[PDB]
Amino acid sequence: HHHHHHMVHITLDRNTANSWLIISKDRRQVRMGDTHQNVSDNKERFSNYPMVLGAQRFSSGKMYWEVDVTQKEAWDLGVCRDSVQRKGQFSLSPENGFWTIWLWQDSYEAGTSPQTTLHIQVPPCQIGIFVDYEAGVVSFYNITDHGSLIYTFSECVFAGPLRPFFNVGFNYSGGNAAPLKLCPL
Ligand SMILES: O=C(O)COc1ccc(F)cc1
């Protein structure tokens, strides 16, 4: 792909984080802690899952960023509406305001309803995410495999400002402690 020139500097919004997440000083990395991180509750925090939003809001234009997923067993990545539900249980779907892919139990899937199987020969260590607001497109790229396409959501109905979306996943296994990291431009 040739989307690299739309690169944006994403930072994580501490206030939206689940209370177990640990965000680095530079706001570019996030991981699951082994306990509650001693923060106050607020209406922005994702309560049920280890999720956090980027601080940046997008309502026009073309945007690109990259995320490091090295040695993780489970994660979700993409974008979402600013007004997505924070509290209780929900599924990641465009109907609920999410445009995402994930790794889970050694398979990759796109967060359609129902979910769509992805075909990845080279397990990615870094994911590229491209958003074209005007066109209604969200695309995912395998940076480990020379930028090959993973998935395109088209005919997107964003219906609001968009925020970068992250889920570090649970660590029931002891094999999923590694962070998500925003990669430098
Ligand atoms: O199940 C655990 O690992 C600890 O409890 C949590 C439950 C839901 C969360 F979003 C974060 C932590």
Radius of gyration of the chain (CA): 15
User: Residue 171 CA: which ligand 1 atom is closest?
Assistant: 3
Strand partners, 66: 128
Could you tell me where the beta strands, DSSP code E, fall in the chain?
A: 21-23, 29-32, 51-53, 62-68, 75-81, 98-104, 107-110, 116-117, 126-132, 137-142, 148-153, 162-167, 180-182
> Omega before 114 cis (within 30°)?
yes
Q: Method used for this model?
A: X-ray
Residue type, 77: L
State how far the Cα of 156 lies from the Cα of 117, in Å rounded to an integer. Answer: 19
Mutational pocket test of ligand 1: of 21, 35, 170, the residue with most ligand atoms within 8 Å of the beta carbon: 170
46 C-alpha to center of ligand 1: Å? 11
17 C-alpha to center of ligand 1: Å? 12
> Domains of the chain by range and CATH?
4-182 (2.60.120.920)
Name the residue among 40, 37, 52 with its Cα closest to residue 179.
52
Nearest CA to ligand 1 atom 12: 20
Write the Ramachandran bin of 173: left for phi over 0, alpha for psi from -120 to 50, otherwise beta: alpha
State how far the Cα of 90 lies from the Cα of 144, in Å rounded to an integer. Answer: 31
Residue type, 174: G
Burial of 41 (0-12, 13-18, 19+ CB in 10 A): exposed
User: Residue 48 CA: which ligand 1 atom is closest?
Assistant: 10
Name 112's Cβ contacts closer than 8 Å, sequence gap at least 6: 93, 94, 153
Write the Ramachandran bin of 71: left for phi over 0, alpha for psi from -120 to 50, otherwise beta: left
DSSP state of 76: E
Cα dihedral 147, 145, 76, 166 in deg (nearest 10)? -50
Beta carbons of 75 and 102 less than 8 angstroms apart: yes
CB of 167 closer than 6 A to ligand 1? no
51 φ/ψ angles, rounded to the nearest 5 degrees: -110, 155
Structural resolution in Å:
1.1
Q: What's the CA angle centered on 32, arms 141 and 93, to 5 degrees?
A: 45
Beta carbons of 156 and 134 less than 8 angstroms apart: no
Specify the 3-state DSSP secondary structure of 5.
Answer: helix
Q: How far is CA 73 from the centre of its chain?
A: 15
Q: Where are the alpha helices (DSSP H) in the chain?
A: none
